[PDB]
Amino acid sequence: VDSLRHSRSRLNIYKALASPSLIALSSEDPFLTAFQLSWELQELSKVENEFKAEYEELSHQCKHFAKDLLDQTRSSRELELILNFR
Amino acid sequence: VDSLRHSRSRLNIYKALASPSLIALSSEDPFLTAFQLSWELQELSKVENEFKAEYEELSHQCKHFAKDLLDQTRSSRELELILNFRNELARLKLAIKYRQKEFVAQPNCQQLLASRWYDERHWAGKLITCVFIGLMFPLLSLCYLVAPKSRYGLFIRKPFIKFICHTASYLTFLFLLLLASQHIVNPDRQGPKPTTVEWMILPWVLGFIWTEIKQMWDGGFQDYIHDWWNLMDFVMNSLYLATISLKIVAYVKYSGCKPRDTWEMWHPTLVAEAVFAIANIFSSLRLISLFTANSHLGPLQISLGRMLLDILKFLFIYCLVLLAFANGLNQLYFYYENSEGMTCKGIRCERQNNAFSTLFETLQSLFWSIFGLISLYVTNVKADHKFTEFVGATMFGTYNVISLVVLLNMLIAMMNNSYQHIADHADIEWKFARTKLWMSYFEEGGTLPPPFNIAENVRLNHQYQEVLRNLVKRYVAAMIRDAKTEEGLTE
Amino acid sequence: YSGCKPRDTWEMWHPTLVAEAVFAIANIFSSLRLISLFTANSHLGPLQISLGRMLLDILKFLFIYCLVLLAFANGLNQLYFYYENSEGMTCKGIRCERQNNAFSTLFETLQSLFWSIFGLISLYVTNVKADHKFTEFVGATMFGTYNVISLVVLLNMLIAMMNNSYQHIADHADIEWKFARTKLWMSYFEEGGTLPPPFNIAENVRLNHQYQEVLRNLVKRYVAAMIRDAKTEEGLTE
Numbered sequence: 001v002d003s004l005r006h007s008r009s010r011l012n013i014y015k016a017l018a019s020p021s022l023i024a025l026s027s028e029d030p031f032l033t034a035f036q037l038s039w040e041l042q043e044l045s046k047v048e049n050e051f052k053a054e055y056e057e058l059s060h061q062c063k064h065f066a067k068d069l070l071d072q073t074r075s076s077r078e079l080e081l082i083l084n085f086r
Numbered sequence: 087v088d089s090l091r092h093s094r095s096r097l098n099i100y101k102a103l104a105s106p107s108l109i110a111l112s113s114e115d116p117f118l119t120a121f122q123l124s125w126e127l128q129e130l131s132k133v134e135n136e137f138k139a140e141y142e143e144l145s146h147q148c149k150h151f152a153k154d155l156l157d158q159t160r161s162s163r164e165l166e167l168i169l170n171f172r173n174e175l176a177r178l179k180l181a182i183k184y185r186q187k188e189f190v191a192q193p194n195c196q197q198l199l200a201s202r203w204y205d206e207r208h209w210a211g212k213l214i215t216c217v218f219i220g221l222m223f224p225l226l227s228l229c230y231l232v233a234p235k236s237r238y239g240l241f242i243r244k245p246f247i248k249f250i251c252h253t254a255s256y257l258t259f260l261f262l263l264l265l266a267s268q269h270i271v272n273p274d275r276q277g278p279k280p281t282t283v284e285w286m287i288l289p290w291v292l293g294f295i296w297t298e299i300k301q302m303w304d305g306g307f308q309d310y311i312h313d314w315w316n317l318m319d320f321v322m323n324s325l326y327l328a329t330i331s332l333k334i335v336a337y338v339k340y341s342g343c344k345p346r347d348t349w350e351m352w353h354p355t356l357v358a359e360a361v362f363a364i365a366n367i368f369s370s371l372r373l374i375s376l377f378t379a380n381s382h383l384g385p386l387q388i389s390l391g392r393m394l395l396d397i398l399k400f401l402f403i404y405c406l407v408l409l410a411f412a413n414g415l416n417q418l419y420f421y422y423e424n425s426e427g428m429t430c431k432g433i434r435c436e437r438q439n440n441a442f443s444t445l446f447e448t449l450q451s452l453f454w455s456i457f458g459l460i461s462l463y464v465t466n467v468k469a470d471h472k473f474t475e476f477v478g479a480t481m482f483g484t485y486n487v488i489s490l491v492v493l494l495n496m497l498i499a500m501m502n503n504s505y506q507h508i509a510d511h512a513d514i515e516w517k518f519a520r521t522k523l524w525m526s527y528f529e530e531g532g533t534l535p536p537p538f539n540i541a542e543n544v545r546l547n548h549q550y551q552e553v554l555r556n557l558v559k560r561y562v563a564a565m566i567r568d569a570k571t572e573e574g575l576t577e
Numbered sequence: 578y579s580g581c582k583p584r585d586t587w588e589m590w591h592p593t594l595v596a597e598a599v600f601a602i603a604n605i606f607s608s609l610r611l612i613s614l615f616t617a618n619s620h621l622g623p624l625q626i627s628l629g630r631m632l633l634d635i636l637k638f639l640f641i642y643c644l645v646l647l648a649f650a651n652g653l654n655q656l657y658f659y660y661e662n663s664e665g666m667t668c669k670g671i672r673c674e675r676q677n678n679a680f681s682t683l684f685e686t687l688q689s690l691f692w693s694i695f696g697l698i699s700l701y702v703t704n705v706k707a708d709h710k711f712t713e714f715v716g717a718t719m720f721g722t723y724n725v726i727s728l729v730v731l732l733n734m735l736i737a738m739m740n741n742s743y744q745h746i747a748d749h750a751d752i753e754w755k756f757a758r759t760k761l762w763m764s765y766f767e768e769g770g771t772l773p774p775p776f777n778i779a780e781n782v783r784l785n786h787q788y789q790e791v792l793r794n795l796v797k798r799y800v801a802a803m804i805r806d807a808k809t810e811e812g813l814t815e
């Protein structure tokens with residue numbers, strides 16, 4: 001019915017979810033949420049084609065968060081525990 | 087008298103008027119003032135040519151103000167109350183008329199139009215459904231004009247479907263054009279009779295001319311001739327008319343079935359064929375404009391079309407060099423026009439000869455050497471003068487160096503430098519063009535392809551004024567009060 | 578088929594000839610696959626990835642060029658199709674020593690308009706055996722206009738597009754190259770193929786403890802470093 005409000009609400013929610021602090025506060029596995037959220041935003045970038053830039057930037061920042069979180073490692077054993085998990 | 091004071095006073099006044107706060111404080115309709123002020127400043131940019139930058143920047147900021155004011159909308163009903171104020175979508179038509187590109191390509195404005203255009207997938211589905219609607223166009227176009235009731239005749243009024251139908255009609259016309267030049271569908275008899283394909287082509291030509299006349303009464307030789315595609319339509323329709331009026335002259339005057347080889351130049355049939363071919367070129371070339379509706383080929387086409395007023399100036403500078411060297415090279419060789427027992431003379435023969443004997447041949451020779459199609463033995467005479475044959479070869483070589491190592495690379499450098507200043511405002515331009523394409527199909531004026539073609543207001547001011555008051559209040563609170571506290575610090 | 582007939586006096590579509598043609602076209606691809614070997618090098622890798630990323634931008638341009646080609650072919654075939662002499666000619670077409678009938682059919686017209694991007698179509702192909710110096714001028718002007726549009730306008734716009742695209746690519750270039758090299762390597766870490774073609778025919782719950790401890794430390798370090806120690810380096814405003 002009201003497409004304008006629907007679009008704003010969806011974008012506001014997705015922009016809230018793709019936040020490093022909200023992920024680092026209440027999330028069972030930061031890497032899974034970053035991966036999945038980046039994929040969802042990349043997909044939505046092609047449906048809501050009127051707002052491509054917003055979704056592309058949000059997915060880009062979700063990609064940079066996982067890399068920044070992997071830089072806080074100070075041992076090889078500590079890195080192998082992450083890259084080998086299943 | 088005192089031009090300096092007059093200029094300062096006029097610029098100061100206009101710079102005061104084009105101020106977002108002064109407009110938002112004392113103005114009966116912000117959008118009208120923004121549109122009109124932007125147009126006035128754009129016009130003054132060409133009279134007071136000593137101060138172009140000032141007026142251009144002021145008009146640009148007046149354009150950005152209207153867009154920023156349209157972003158303070160939080161409902162679809164609230165947006166439709168603005169775009170429909172005054173028939174349907176009158177404000178959007180006014181904005182397109184005033185060339186408000188930033189206002190038109192707004193994301194929320196660009197979504198209402200999409201919803202009004204599609205009215206109900208992936209790539210394969212959109213590929214395979216658009217073929218099924220375009221194959222069966224004639225029966226829809228036939229059942230619309232007999233019983234326009236809610237069974238099948240209201241399915242050709244939807245803008246997307248109408249666009250598909252017109253595309254299918256144009257593609258059928260192109261297929262017939264490709265089919266006209268076949269050795270199965272007539273021989274060469276002097277002053278012939280139209281074949282089975284000319285009679286099918288004639289109704290599309292008539293329909294195209296009728297659509298053009300309809301569209302040219304409405305505009306009135308102003309901003310209709312601006313659109314270059316309409317100019318091309320005019321030229322090709324002129325050529326088609328000239329083709330009709332020569333196939334008849336050669337019918338009522340000439341006849342007799344003479345062999346083709348032993349005809350004589352300017353025979354009306356040959357000139358008819360020449361004009362028809364040159365018209366086919368334009369008719370087929372008009373198929374580029376179909377792809378301003380695509381999302382990938384659209385922006386690229388707009389960018390290509392914007393780098394054409396910068397190539398024409400360069401070609402005009404090149405023609406002067408061409409004429410100078412032709413004048414030089416014809417003065418040297420015009421005493422040697424042998425043409426002694428030669429079946430063919432000129433450069434368009436197997437053994438090229440007399441390449442610089444006349445001015446016309448000289449221009450042709452200097453043109454076809456941009457592509458390397460003029461051999462080097464054309465700078466020889468039957469005598470044994472190894473001094474004019476050296477001056478001529480040096481003139482030819484200097485022309486080649488100036489034309490293919492200096493002017494071409496400067497054209498490349500110019501185009502590279504221009505393309506960067508274009509590819510920033512590229513999506514705004516493309517969406518403005520796509521919006522014009524769409525708006526041409528929202529009305530029940532044509533609604534039919536060429537082959538088958540031959541108070542009520544005072545109450546609404548209350549809601550509109552309420553909407554403007556809220557929009558102005560939101561803009562003041564957001565832009566000129568909440569983004570002034572984010573500037574930097576100084577001494 | 579069998580019988581040892583001489584090669585010259587065969588007939589087209591004889592299966593041996595088509596076998597040879599398909600075999601040659603397959604050799605081209607097989608030899609071309611040798612480019613992918615050099616995503617493992619450190620110098621030729623990034624350059625190859627950059628070349629391969631500027632190909633979806635050339636295809637669109639070629640699609641716009643084919644429309645111009647088709648328009649001018651449609652124009653040029655309409656003018657010359659009445660002059661298909663072919664009178665006592667051993668060879669006809671443009672792939673012969675004396676080129677002839679360059680615009681007599683649509684297929685030859687497309688071929689003629691293609692081979693003139695490289696300058697291999699002579700200029701005497703715009704003549705007829707008659708003496709009509711008006712169609713021979715309209716045809717030469719059509720050919721010249723095609724040459725100008727194709728070799729002075731569209732080519733330089735392709736160059737400008739490629740220059741403008743290459744700068745937006747050469748920033749994320751090493752990320753792309755290392756991602757590609759990593760995929761190449763990972764394809765050889767398992768014992769699946771392990772053999773070239775010629776000779777080819779709780780256990781988890783305990784670990785969640787260590788993984789959770791590692792995540793807790795990583796999240797704590799990230800919070801301390803990024804969203805608490807790099808927020809005190811912003812600028813000042815009003």
Ligand SMILES: CCCCCCCCCCCCCCCC(=O)OC[C@H](COP(=O)(O)O)OC(=O)CCCCCCCCCCCCCCC
Binds near residue numbers: 476487
């Ligand atoms: C790799 C880049 C290629 C560029 C080539 C440039 C070569 C320059 C000259 C090299 C010398 C070789 C000549 C020897 C042969 C010979 O003697 O003979 C002269 C030959 C001509 O052929 P002939 O041998 O039959 O005489 O070559 C020449 O005519 C040389 C002409 C050079 C002209 C240079 C002009 C400079 C451009 C200035 C800018 C103009 C501004 C625009 C005005 C509007």
Ligand SMILES: CCCCCCCCCCCCCCCC(=O)OC[C@H](COP(=O)(O)O)OC(=O)CCCCCCCCCCCCCCC
Binds near residue numbers: 494
């Ligand atoms: C250094 C850069 C080189 C560029 C050369 C440009 C030259 C331009 C014309 C020079 C005039 C010489 C002609 C005189 C000879 C003659 O009369 O004869 C005409 C000859 C043809 O050979 P003939 O002599 O046999 O007729 O040359 C021509 O046909 C001129 C054609 C010019 C076409 C210009 C088109 C402009 C491009 C517009 C953009 C298109 C947009 C893309 C659409 C999708």
Ligand SMILES: O=C1CN(c2cn[nH]c(=O)c2Cl)CCN1C1CCCCC1
Binds near residue numbers: 252294323372
């Ligand atoms: O709007 C026009 C005008 N046309 C004219 C007019 N006058 N003379 C001519 O030769 C021609 Cl082709 C037909 C092409 N189109 C569009 C129809 C929908 C698909 C994209 C093209």
Ligand SMILES: [Ca+2]
Binds near residue numbers: 298301316319
């Ligand atoms: Ca038109």
